[PDB]
Amino acid sequence: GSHSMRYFFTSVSRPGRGEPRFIAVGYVDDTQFVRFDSDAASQRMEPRAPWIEQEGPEYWDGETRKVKAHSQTHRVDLGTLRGYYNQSEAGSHTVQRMYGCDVGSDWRFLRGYHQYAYDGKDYIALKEDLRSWTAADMAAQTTKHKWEAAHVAEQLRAYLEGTCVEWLRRYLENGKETLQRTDAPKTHMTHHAVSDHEATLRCWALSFYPAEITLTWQRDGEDQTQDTELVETRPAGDGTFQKWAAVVVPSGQEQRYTCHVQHEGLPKPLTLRWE
Amino acid sequence: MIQRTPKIQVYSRHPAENGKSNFLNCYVSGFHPSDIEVDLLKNGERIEKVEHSDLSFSKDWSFYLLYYTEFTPTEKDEYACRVNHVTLSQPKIVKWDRDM
Amino acid sequence: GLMWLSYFV
């Protein structure tokens, strides 16, 4: 199936407390493989998956230099953005960046991303054509015009459609068994009565990978949102994920409700019922 | 400025079974800003030997972190996660419901 | 592998 490589960068100003915190992580699909944390000891890019450890010193030296240049760039950005919005030195502010590429089942380029957020809101993003920019506000327009003048999109595009895809392919093959796997959800159901005339049905999905899944409750064959509670998909800690979907049902009609599970590890979507 | 309160989930890595080692997890997601303190509590006392994941974020830019510790669930010992964040008027304590 | 060039906002 499809695969992705994604890098996530977070830079946080620390008013009256020195240099910004900078954390960078790399993912292939839902598997992290590298990290840099400004508050860690090595001050280097560090391996986080067995399959990346084999890369030689040339690799690590390079990623280390690049991740520092990324750090340095956002250190300046925090100041630039504070000026753009005429903000005081009193407050802490956050710059976030994400970029990377998707490939299809044929491991050929599908899509590229390159997006910035300031204080948790969209600031600027490369559009899907990888040739133009979406700026969130008037301040962001200044960045847009500067990036148009420097022909940034053209250079990003070459990386996203070419180099980024090259890395993803190389990572996927070195990853081999773990990376390319899909683990179907191990399901089960719970049932604790709440009130005299009501009861809770919780549909469980465990040990699945990748993280992408869909749990849905149906009543007499039709969906239900709004009495259904969905917790956010969560890491189990062993490379698998977990999720659940609950619904409160009239005490006595438990058999009229069905949980529907959709995951790419499942040949066909599952329909479950309490019994 | 964007402010999101953390969604907190406390749970084990594998289905819990008294007497057998496992991992106790506290997963905090959907929060902003990134500053947050998280502790795992055994019988109301903080556990020192806890690890945590590298800060990362979702599509909506909200952050997530996994705090985790190795442990052996015994019928007595109770477990909880305490979370403090600027969106919280007071720290939140989420107990480990071994039976959810 | 990371991009080799960043651009200031």
Side-chain angles (χ1 to χ4, degrees):
Chain A
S2 288
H3 298 282
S4 62
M5 183 177 67
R6 298 271 196 274
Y7 282 108
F8 304 84
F9 310 85
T10 302
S11 202
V12 183
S13 64
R14 297 188 280 197
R17 288 170 49 238
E19 302 289 316
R21 177 76 173 275
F22 180 78
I23 298 170
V25 299
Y27 281 90
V28 168
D29 300 334
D30 298 311
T31 300
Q32 178 190 8
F33 68 101
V34 290
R35 57 95 75 156
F36 178 98
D37 188 342
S38 62
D39 289 12
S42 74
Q43 295 300 297
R44 294 178 58 81
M45 187 77 88
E46 305 176 20
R48 280 305 190 262
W51 42 270
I52 204 63
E53 282 173 28
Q54 69 203 226
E55 301 291 341
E58 315 294 63
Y59 175 83
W60 298 108
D61 288 353
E63 297 306 306
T64 289
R65 290 143 66 195
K66 291 184 280 182
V67 79
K68 286 181 175 170
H70 280 64
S71 174
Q72 180 54 33
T73 288
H74 303 129
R75 179 166 83 181
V76 165
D77 289 344
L78 287 161
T80 304
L81 292 164
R82 184 174 76 82
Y84 281 13
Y85 294 103
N86 197 38
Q87 295 164 330
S88 68
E89 310 181 305
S92 175
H93 297 269
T94 306
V95 164
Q96 281 160 287
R97 165 154 72 148
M98 179 280 287
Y99 71 72
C101 48
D102 298 339
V103 296
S105 294
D106 57 1
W107 293 20
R108 311 178 65 195
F109 173 87
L110 255 203
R111 182 150 149 67
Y113 310 83
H114 182 84
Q115 294 155 200
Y116 279 66
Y118 186 52
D119 287 328
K121 281 151 50 70
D122 286 336
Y123 179 72
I124 193 171
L126 194 57
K127 290 200 203 173
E128 182 160 16
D129 68 354
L130 305 188
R131 294 173 175 267
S132 51
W133 299 99
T134 293
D137 61 19
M138 279 313 316
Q141 288 289 335
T142 309
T143 298
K144 178 163 182 299
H145 300 322
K146 163 167 150 61
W147 285 5
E148 291 169 343
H151 290 71
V152 172
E154 173 183 296
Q155 302 163 229
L156 290 186
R157 183 190 324 120
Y159 168 84
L160 297 173
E161 297 180 346
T163 316
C164 179
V165 172
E166 289 170 351
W167 286 116
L168 185 52
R169 291 168 173 168
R170 173 193 183 85
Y171 295 154
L172 285 165
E173 53 196 48
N174 289 171
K176 207 39 147 124
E177 256 8 321
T178 59
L179 268 199
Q180 300 168 233
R181 83 183 181 279
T182 62
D183 293 316
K186 288 168 165 40
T187 62
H188 77 276
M189 203 155 294
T190 59
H191 174 260
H192 323 120
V194 278
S195 46
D196 296 336
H197 324 292
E198 286 182 320
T200 308
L201 285 173
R202 180 169 295 109
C203 188
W204 280 89
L206 296 175
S207 307
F208 57 89
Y209 183 95
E212 174 62 25
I213 196 168
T214 301
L215 309 183
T216 65
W217 275 109
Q218 291 191 4
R219 192 264 206 186
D220 280 32
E222 52 177 314
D223 284 10
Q224 283 283 276
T225 12
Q226 72 294 259
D227 247 313
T228 154
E229 180 190 15
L230 287 169
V231 293
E232 233 259 342
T233 303
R234 71 198 194 186
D238 61 357
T240 72
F241 295 92
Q242 314 174 347
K243 191 188 192 65
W244 63 251
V247 70
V248 194
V249 308
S251 174
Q253 298 164 246
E254 285 82 344
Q255 55 275 313
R256 297 176 57 161
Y257 294 85
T258 52
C259 174
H260 290 250
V261 186
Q262 306 165 65
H263 185 93
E264 89 158 291
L266 289 173
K268 83 291 286 188
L270 307 178
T271 297
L272 318 169
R273 20 169 36 99
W274 178 247
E275 84 173 44
Chain B
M1 183 77 44
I2 280 311
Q3 281 137 313
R4 296 185 188 266
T5 194
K7 282 108 277 268
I8 312 175
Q9 301 190 68
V10 189
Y11 56 106
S12 44
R13 175 182 293 184
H14 306 293
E17 194 164 309
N18 286 302
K20 295 204 160 192
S21 68
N22 199 342
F23 279 91
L24 175 61
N25 294 329
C26 183
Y27 185 64
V28 298
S29 60
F31 62 102
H32 221 289
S34 64
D35 183 39
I36 193 164
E37 36 168 15
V38 181
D39 279 82
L40 271 33
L41 306 169
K42 178 187 185 178
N43 303 321
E45 284 178 352
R46 83 178 294 265
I47 310 175
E48 292 192 14
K49 209 85 71 175
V50 175
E51 284 162 289
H52 65 269
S53 60
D54 297 300
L55 188 68
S56 188
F57 49 91
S58 315
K59 180 173 180 171
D60 67 355
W61 302 108
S62 68
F63 297 107
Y64 59 82
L65 283 162
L66 179 64
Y67 282 75
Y68 57 95
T69 185
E70 190 194 328
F71 82 135
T72 296
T74 68
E75 189 63 10
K76 44 279 193 190
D77 296 332
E78 275 190 301
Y79 290 94
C81 182
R82 174 183 54 208
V83 170
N84 199 19
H85 188 255
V86 74
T87 60
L88 296 179
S89 49
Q90 50 217 64
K92 193 170 300 179
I93 320 276
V94 174
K95 284 184 172 179
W96 175 39
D97 187 347
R98 321 176 43 160
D99 205 46
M100 194 194 201
Chain C
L2 291 167
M3 203 182 302
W4 265 102
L5 189 34
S6 274
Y7 311 89
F8 298 103
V9 305

